[PDB]
Amino acid sequence: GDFRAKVWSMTGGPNCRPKHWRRNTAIAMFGVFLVCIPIAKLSAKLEQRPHMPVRPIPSQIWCKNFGTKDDYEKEH
Amino acid sequence: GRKKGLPEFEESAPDGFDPENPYKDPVAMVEMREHIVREKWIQIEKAKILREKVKWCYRVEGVNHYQKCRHLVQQYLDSTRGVGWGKDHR
Amino acid sequence: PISATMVGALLGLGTQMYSNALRKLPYMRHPWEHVVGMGLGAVFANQLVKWDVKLKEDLDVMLAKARAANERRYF
Amino acid sequence: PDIYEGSPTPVTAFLSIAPKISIFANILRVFIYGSYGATLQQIFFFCSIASMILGALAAMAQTKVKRLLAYSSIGHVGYICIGFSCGTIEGIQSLLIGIFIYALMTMDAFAIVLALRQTRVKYIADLGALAKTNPILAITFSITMFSYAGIPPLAGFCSKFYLFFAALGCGAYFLALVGVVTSVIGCFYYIRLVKRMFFDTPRTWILYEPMDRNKSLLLAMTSFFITLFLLYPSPLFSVTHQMALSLYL
Amino acid sequence: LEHFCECYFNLSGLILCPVLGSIILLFIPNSRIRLIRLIGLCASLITFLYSLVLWIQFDSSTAKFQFVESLRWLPYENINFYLGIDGISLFFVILTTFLIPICILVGWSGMRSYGKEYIIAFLICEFLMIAVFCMLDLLLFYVFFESVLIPMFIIIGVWGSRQRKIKAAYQFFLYTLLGSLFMLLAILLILFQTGTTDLQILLTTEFSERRQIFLWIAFFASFAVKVPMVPVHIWLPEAHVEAPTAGSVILAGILLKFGTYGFLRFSIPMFPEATLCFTPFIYTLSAIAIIYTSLTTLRQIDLKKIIAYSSVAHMNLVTIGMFSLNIQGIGGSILLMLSHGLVSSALFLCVGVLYDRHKTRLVRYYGGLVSTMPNFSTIFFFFTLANMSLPGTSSFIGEFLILVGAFQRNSLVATLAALGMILGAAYSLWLYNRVVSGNLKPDFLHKFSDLNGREVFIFIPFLVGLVWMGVYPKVFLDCMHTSVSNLVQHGKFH
Amino acid sequence: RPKGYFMNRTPPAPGQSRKWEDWELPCYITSFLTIVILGVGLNAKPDLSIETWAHQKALERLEMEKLAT
Amino acid sequence: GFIMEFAENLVLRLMENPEERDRKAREHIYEMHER
Amino acid sequence: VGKHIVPDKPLSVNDELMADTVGKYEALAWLSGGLGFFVGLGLLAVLNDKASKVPFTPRVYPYDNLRVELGGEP
Amino acid sequence: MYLLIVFLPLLGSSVAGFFGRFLGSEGSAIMTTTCVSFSSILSLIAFYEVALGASACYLRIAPWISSEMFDASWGFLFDSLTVVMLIVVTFISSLVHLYSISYMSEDPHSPRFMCYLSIFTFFMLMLVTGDNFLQLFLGWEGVGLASYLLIHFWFTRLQADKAAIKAMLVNRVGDFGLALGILGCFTLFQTVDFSTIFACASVPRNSWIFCNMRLNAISLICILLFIGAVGKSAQIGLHTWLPDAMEGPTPVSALIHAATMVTAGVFMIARCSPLFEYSPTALIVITFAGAMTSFLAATTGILQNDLKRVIAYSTCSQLGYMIFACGISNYSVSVFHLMNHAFFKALLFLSAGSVIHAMSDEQDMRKMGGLASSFPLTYAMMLIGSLSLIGFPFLTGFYSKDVILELAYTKYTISGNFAFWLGSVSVLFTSYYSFRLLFLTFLVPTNSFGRDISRCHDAPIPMAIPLILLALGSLFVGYLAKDMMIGLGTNFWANSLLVLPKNEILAESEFAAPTIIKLIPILFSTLGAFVAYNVNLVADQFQRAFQTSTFCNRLYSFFNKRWFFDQVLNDFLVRSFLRFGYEVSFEALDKGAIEILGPYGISYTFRRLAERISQLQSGFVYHYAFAMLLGLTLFVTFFCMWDSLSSWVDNRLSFILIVSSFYTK
Amino acid sequence: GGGMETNKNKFIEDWGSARENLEHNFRWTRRNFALIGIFGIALPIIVYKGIVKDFHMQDEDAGRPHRKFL
């Protein structure tokens, strides 16, 4: 409105139209993809698949934890 | 300064403790309380390891878990009775 | 370390500045009086420690006499 | 209370300290050194209880500084006479310790009162805004008032401690109850003076003339003793124990 | 017997730090505001760092008091005193050292009119409070706790906002003194048996059942005024509301913990038979207080009265867990203690921000602050959530672990205690919406300012603290479990 | 440019820099130390927790009683 | 050289020796019970 | 929104907290009737006894009604 | 890769929430939609590897709450049930985010709205993927918090704040029952891990003291857990929050209050089927509650005039069907009906939102009429969804709902016969309110305003595309998935759902039932369409009875005002607790007796005593001398003249009279 | 027009000050006798006996004599 133009918020406030919002949006997209990198490696290292799938799956490429929990008497 | 490694404790119960009269040897009464706590923690971690076996038995065997994990369930349930400081005294 | 002389000198200095402040004067109004107060505090602390030692020594003898008199009852 | 209020303030200061030492010496040498039934001990016990109760309530009623100090002294002699009643060596030791500490605290308080009498202090309300017009003096008077109330680690806590110690030992519980209630009442009417000097915002202030060097030196020394006696209390304990035994052997 | 510790970082230096700060400030002219402020802030920060180092060198395998060091009182050496911490008291020392610099920072803008007297009082409070948390003696615990009353009295009476501060300070001092005197009676009762008041010794001395009951009742009376427990809780509202913001922060974040800490350090271990006989009695008072005082909180119209009334409900959940006498109960009770010392302080900080600008505490005057103070509104909402024990926040960890411990002992007390979830959410959300949501009321308030740089920095360690304990409470539970286990096992041998 | 100012402080004159208030440097230095003392200290201190000790002891006692009968 | 390995040693020098601690605790209990 | 109303009269004690055509106890009476419909139907289900009117026998499973597969002792 | 599914909406929510000032409405809309969309693509692949490929995934990050035997952790479980929920949550959310890109185009605060949409999805993902009761509890509270934030998104509206607070408090009561169920679970098994509990659930037979009563532990746990489902699924006990939750924007109603959060209670009974199967008592209670709710919501939805509320009461009715389907030991059919409901309730809500946008935020059906030609795409979308809802043959709704009524017939018990009647009578009521919506909004002669029809427009692409996709899912998924989820003997669910052999009734339902039963829905559905057409288009004096008869007037108010459920609760329960807090705990006790028997009373009496003692010091020298003389006399009399007085006196009466003296004049 | 401080309202402030001084209006009416009787004495006692009975039922469930309390 009127005073809201002098109010700072993280979400931008009412009717936020930053001039460079496209270059900002793409910089955000590059950042999130960068953060999605360590998450994927940690997930692939932490995933556990006790059963071999009936058919090959995308995860039989990046994940090496298939059919490893068969000796569950040794779990500790 | 402390030497590198895990903590070490005496494996056996302190001689000098008298179960009929525990407020007779002050030093032993304290080392006995510490020993009992350490022993109970071993039982708690004993059951926790038995809990992990049941978990992966259920996950590996699927709908065949009732017939296949029958023994591990029995062992784990027996260990959790009279464990730690929960609903069982001794 | 922390000795009677040091504590006494510090307490004498503190008293002079406390006395100056109670009179609404500057802390260091008469600094020679601060020197005098440090000297007096050191003397007083050393004398107090010595007196405490002597008092304990005398109390030990008097308690010895008291205990002897009290132990006389069981004869 | 009437004589303390009506006499000139130096007279009141002298009467509140010197004659107590002389007559307690007389009491200890005439009776403890003597021999009779517990009748006299019951006399001092009942007088101690009555003194604590009446002193506490009457001090709570006071609006003037001198009368408040008078009733406070009555309450404290009750606290002291409790030590005579129990009839032990530690009773006499604690009586002597209480007399010593009360004398020093009373000299502190009367040095402050004599300093303020140059401006004719008469009412407790006259101390309004003293934390502003003389901050160091307001703190010194507050240290004394908290010592009077018995709050640790101040020197006044010894009397409270022995009062309760003798009671739970001599087996008394009514005495413990009376001590608790009177201690709380005393704390209230002592911290009322701190509230007046620190919390109130009166429309009219009284600006006090600064004290002379004698009273400031004595005040500084007594304030250091009050705040710090319990850090190094051994000489007083040993000398009082020495005196207690010199009475018998 | 000299027990001096070999560690470089010990309890003595941490004790001395604020004492040295106070002694230095007494002599610095009040004209030198910049220097006074910086000296106080730096001293408090150094103390906080020292406490963190004390955390670093902590052994989580032992049940023996750590960093134990002794201080002699007489050359007769009959009465000798000890300092030491364990898994139960370490985090309370760290919390005290964390909260004091916050209190100095809160009154940064008004330090021209506060002066050295404000910083000195808070430093003396810090020194006394750390001492209290570090004692292995019943007698020194009494002296140092009873001593904290003088600076808190001064802080309430001098820098409080209205004339109600007179009555508030009077009630605070008198209630606390009554409780302390009852503790003193118990300490002399113990001394007559034992000849000493040393914690390590009385832990090894057997007390008769009758004397256990009587000593428990005297210790109870002292600790229950400080918890607070019904019906001796009524001093807390006036005291916590009328105090200045930093005064409220210290009162609710640290001073409230002394009673529950006294239950854990002395009453529970020393009298194990008396503890069991009184567990139903403790359960009833705690459960009544949670239900009654939560419903009272709903109908309060003062911002600070709502937050202060909330603490009574939270502390009585803490008593429920610690008297369950299992790992989840006691471990949960300690975790809620520390979490409450962070959430309650931050909530008092949020209201203080609003009162500093607008000088009103009535809820009806505010409203619609989201459109003028979005940064304050976002921070206010987070700590509002943490006061409802929302999972992810630190206070949920303590709350659920206590309910687990209470359920295994008495299902009924666990059910009545779990009603705090319904009631706690009701007033917390009602408070937040009536203050922040809705429309502005320009007839009452038309001039606003969001948080400045200092206010933003003040909240950051609070936000990090609650999230950290909320999602990964293992760093705390690891250092507490051995001391907690030995507390539960105390008194039995099977 | 955005609406309002971050933390409601007017920007300094162009070409100049904001003056740091007295509290900022000691608080920022302590914050950095707090991260380094805890982030490195907690991860470098030995794992002496009772649970870690008992887990190793439980593994061997389960080993000794399973290998033996 | 390596930061964390240096960190372990530094932390280790700051911790009281377990045996020395446990012994002073027993001396205390024994001596005070007999005193 | 447009203008909040500044009080011109003394506020009541239950002002912080302050269903039009039907009264209070009458609404409870109506709602109990609706809950009485559910109770009445439940009783009819009791008197219907559809358990006594099943058109097939209970299943019987092989291998001792799956005793071992259901966790029974081999 | 599996972690990316859960945490992608969190990152998108974080970017638009923390950096929305640099991205604006456009950038935040792009960012949150893309992150949710990628999470939806990975959900389809996870469904490929776990459900069709029959390979489950387990992921443990770190311990969360480890205290002795209590073992709550940050762990994720992906089985057939989980990936089915994963598909429902992410796919419908991607469409709602796209839909909101256009629907919230003119709102001032879109970046915060998109932030709230993504944080709800993350909490919903945490809920369905948790491998333990506590991780489930975290997402149970998170979806309630996110629902609260979105219901009062327009924070200036007093009605929105009231509804959002109501939604939180009603659901917190459910969290009270869920939390107690978790405590019982841990106490019985000394673990909260799902796999361990499900492996051990057949064994325990012990009894427990609860409410000073002896109860079976497994039964107590399951009934306590059900209470949590009752609140989240808006069942009979705690239902009234759902109708009021329409205060939030239309996309919020489609995603949270109809597609996912409302179905979390059904998911929990299905996920805990290996535990619920060993409590026949809870299964009876679940059967009764589900059937009761379905009848409740339908009879209320017949007089509702708001578009969003008619569709909301439809959701509540449909949840009852899934709940009692769970209650009769048929969990796979419950999840099948849940998946179906998601495609057609989202279509009905998202299509109804397009009408509301086009009619300048007009929501009343009594001021609409016409628009069957003015909005061809929207009417076509509402036609498909409403026909799919009532169970029109071979659409998405026919393959699940009709099996539910057929299974309830095949259950020969007291609860089974109860649900069959109430379920069957409800299908006649839902058909009535469904076609009443169709008839009054687009087919009757217009009752709308002139300025409203002059400003109509149909849905742009970001709104139109999700509607088309949901229409396709409402025609084909029901057929495309029947054999997968409920096919006789299908092993799609693997070990996710457990049904004991004594409870299998699927074969008998499809082979031993009369052919008349398999038609009961269409007889009632057709009758409902006909009665709706009669009342709404050929009836003009069926409204006079409501204006001249007190009973017919009161009966109309009864059903329109939701059986007076909110009013009784407010008048007898909410007001009672509010009045207690002021008049009793505060005024009677705190500011009352505790004050009078405390600091207020203590101060008064001690002031009066100090007054009385002060007047003793009268100032008269005679009084002081008299006091000394009386003290000497008392000393003599007590300490010597107390030898032969004891024959007449008692030490009791002595001190009695002294204290009694204080009360004189 | 000036100043951040709220524009006080006499009726809101009288409302506020009335609440803070409620103990001045406490009169031992029949309503207060009943409320203090029911909710200050009776309800705490009922809760205490329910808690104690909960322990006693656990005692007999475990074949142990009733636990003495208080």
PDB file of C-alpha atoms in Angstrom, chain I residues 284-375:
ATOM      1  CA  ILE I 284     -15.517 -52.696  15.925  1.00  0.00           C
ATOM      2  CA  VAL I 285     -15.063 -49.155  17.260  1.00  0.00           C
ATOM      3  CA  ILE I 286     -13.463 -48.123  13.963  1.00  0.00           C
ATOM      4  CA  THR I 287     -16.344 -49.698  12.032  1.00  0.00           C
ATOM      5  CA  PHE I 288     -18.963 -47.858  14.093  1.00  0.00           C
ATOM      6  CA  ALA I 289     -17.247 -44.464  13.863  1.00  0.00           C
ATOM      7  CA  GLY I 290     -16.652 -44.619  10.116  1.00  0.00           C
ATOM      8  CA  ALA I 291     -20.239 -45.536   9.254  1.00  0.00           C
ATOM      9  CA  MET I 292     -21.652 -42.896  11.605  1.00  0.00           C
ATOM     10  CA  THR I 293     -19.538 -40.135  10.046  1.00  0.00           C
ATOM     11  CA  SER I 294     -20.594 -40.971   6.480  1.00  0.00           C
ATOM     12  CA  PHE I 295     -24.281 -40.602   7.345  1.00  0.00           C
ATOM     13  CA  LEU I 296     -23.549 -37.440   9.346  1.00  0.00           C
ATOM     14  CA  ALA I 297     -21.778 -35.542   6.546  1.00  0.00           C
ATOM     15  CA  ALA I 298     -24.311 -36.442   3.788  1.00  0.00           C
ATOM     16  CA  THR I 299     -27.448 -35.246   5.675  1.00  0.00           C
ATOM     17  CA  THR I 300     -25.624 -31.933   6.374  1.00  0.00           C
ATOM     18  CA  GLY I 301     -24.485 -31.476   2.727  1.00  0.00           C
ATOM     19  CA  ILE I 302     -28.110 -31.498   1.424  1.00  0.00           C
ATOM     20  CA  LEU I 303     -28.996 -27.973   2.702  1.00  0.00           C
ATOM     21  CA  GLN I 304     -25.541 -26.307   2.289  1.00  0.00           C
ATOM     22  CA  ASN I 305     -25.599 -23.338  -0.129  1.00  0.00           C
ATOM     23  CA  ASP I 306     -21.852 -22.635  -0.393  1.00  0.00           C
ATOM     24  CA  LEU I 307     -19.978 -24.529  -3.107  1.00  0.00           C
ATOM     25  CA  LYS I 308     -16.916 -25.202  -0.957  1.00  0.00           C
ATOM     26  CA  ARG I 309     -18.936 -26.520   1.978  1.00  0.00           C
ATOM     27  CA  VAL I 310     -21.042 -28.955  -0.056  1.00  0.00           C
ATOM     28  CA  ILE I 311     -17.793 -30.449  -1.430  1.00  0.00           C
ATOM     29  CA  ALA I 312     -16.226 -30.391   2.060  1.00  0.00           C
ATOM     30  CA  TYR I 313     -19.092 -32.369   3.602  1.00  0.00           C
ATOM     31  CA  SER I 314     -18.680 -34.778   0.665  1.00  0.00           C
ATOM     32  CA  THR I 315     -15.023 -35.328   1.723  1.00  0.00           C
ATOM     33  CA  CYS I 316     -16.059 -36.051   5.315  1.00  0.00           C
ATOM     34  CA  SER I 317     -18.622 -38.604   4.123  1.00  0.00           C
ATOM     35  CA  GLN I 318     -16.085 -40.363   1.856  1.00  0.00           C
ATOM     36  CA  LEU I 319     -13.542 -40.604   4.725  1.00  0.00           C
ATOM     37  CA  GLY I 320     -16.143 -42.526   6.703  1.00  0.00           C
ATOM     38  CA  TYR I 321     -16.253 -45.096   3.905  1.00  0.00           C
ATOM     39  CA  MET I 322     -12.485 -45.609   4.023  1.00  0.00           C
ATOM     40  CA  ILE I 323     -12.470 -45.753   7.826  1.00  0.00           C
ATOM     41  CA  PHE I 324     -15.045 -48.511   8.231  1.00  0.00           C
ATOM     42  CA  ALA I 325     -13.459 -50.321   5.284  1.00  0.00           C
ATOM     43  CA  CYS I 326     -10.355 -50.380   7.476  1.00  0.00           C
ATOM     44  CA  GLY I 327     -12.593 -51.437  10.366  1.00  0.00           C
ATOM     45  CA  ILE I 328     -13.672 -54.647   8.624  1.00  0.00           C
ATOM     46  CA  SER I 329     -10.045 -55.740   7.983  1.00  0.00           C
ATOM     47  CA  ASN I 330      -9.939 -54.481   4.371  1.00  0.00           C
ATOM     48  CA  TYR I 331      -7.059 -52.003   4.304  1.00  0.00           C
ATOM     49  CA  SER I 332      -6.088 -52.353   0.636  1.00  0.00           C
ATOM     50  CA  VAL I 333      -9.598 -51.317  -0.414  1.00  0.00           C
ATOM     51  CA  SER I 334      -9.357 -48.300   1.904  1.00  0.00           C
ATOM     52  CA  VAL I 335      -6.068 -47.132   0.273  1.00  0.00           C
ATOM     53  CA  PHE I 336      -7.612 -47.825  -3.194  1.00  0.00           C
ATOM     54  CA  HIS I 337     -10.641 -45.592  -2.361  1.00  0.00           C
ATOM     55  CA  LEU I 338      -8.196 -42.966  -0.879  1.00  0.00           C
ATOM     56  CA  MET I 339      -6.221 -42.882  -4.182  1.00  0.00           C
ATOM     57  CA  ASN I 340      -9.508 -42.600  -6.150  1.00  0.00           C
ATOM     58  CA  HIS I 341     -10.892 -39.815  -3.858  1.00  0.00           C
ATOM     59  CA  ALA I 342      -7.699 -37.757  -4.485  1.00  0.00           C
ATOM     60  CA  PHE I 343      -8.315 -37.515  -8.286  1.00  0.00           C
ATOM     61  CA  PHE I 344     -12.074 -36.648  -8.130  1.00  0.00           C
ATOM     62  CA  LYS I 345     -12.270 -34.496  -4.942  1.00  0.00           C
ATOM     63  CA  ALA I 346      -9.336 -32.394  -6.278  1.00  0.00           C
ATOM     64  CA  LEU I 347     -11.207 -32.120  -9.624  1.00  0.00           C
ATOM     65  CA  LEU I 348     -14.449 -31.073  -7.820  1.00  0.00           C
ATOM     66  CA  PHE I 349     -12.612 -28.475  -5.642  1.00  0.00           C
ATOM     67  CA  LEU I 350     -10.271 -27.186  -8.374  1.00  0.00           C
ATOM     68  CA  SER I 351     -13.157 -27.003 -10.850  1.00  0.00           C
ATOM     69  CA  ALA I 352     -15.369 -25.283  -8.266  1.00  0.00           C
ATOM     70  CA  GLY I 353     -12.588 -22.772  -7.663  1.00  0.00           C
ATOM     71  CA  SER I 354     -12.607 -21.878 -11.353  1.00  0.00           C
ATOM     72  CA  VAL I 355     -16.321 -21.059 -11.040  1.00  0.00           C
ATOM     73  CA  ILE I 356     -15.656 -18.904  -7.975  1.00  0.00           C
ATOM     74  CA  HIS I 357     -12.913 -16.979  -9.784  1.00  0.00           C
ATOM     75  CA  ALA I 358     -15.096 -16.414 -12.850  1.00  0.00           C
ATOM     76  CA  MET I 359     -18.112 -15.214 -10.794  1.00  0.00           C
ATOM     77  CA  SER I 360     -16.084 -12.544  -8.911  1.00  0.00           C
ATOM     78  CA  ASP I 361     -15.723 -14.662  -5.745  1.00  0.00           C
ATOM     79  CA  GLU I 362     -19.393 -15.657  -5.651  1.00  0.00           C
ATOM     80  CA  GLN I 363     -19.743 -18.900  -3.685  1.00  0.00           C
ATOM     81  CA  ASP I 364     -23.499 -19.109  -3.022  1.00  0.00           C
ATOM     82  CA  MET I 365     -25.457 -21.524  -5.284  1.00  0.00           C
ATOM     83  CA  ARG I 366     -28.678 -19.476  -4.668  1.00  0.00           C
ATOM     84  CA  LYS I 367     -27.100 -16.633  -6.734  1.00  0.00           C
ATOM     85  CA  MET I 368     -25.662 -18.648  -9.655  1.00  0.00           C
ATOM     86  CA  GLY I 369     -27.744 -20.627 -12.188  1.00  0.00           C
ATOM     87  CA  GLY I 370     -26.943 -21.036 -15.895  1.00  0.00           C
ATOM     88  CA  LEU I 371     -23.216 -21.295 -17.010  1.00  0.00           C
ATOM     89  CA  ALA I 372     -23.698 -24.768 -18.569  1.00  0.00           C
ATOM     90  CA  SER I 373     -22.842 -22.999 -21.876  1.00  0.00           C
ATOM     91  CA  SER I 374     -20.803 -20.058 -20.471  1.00  0.00           C
ATOM     92  CA  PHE I 375     -18.184 -22.448 -18.949  1.00  0.00           C
TER      93      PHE I 375
END
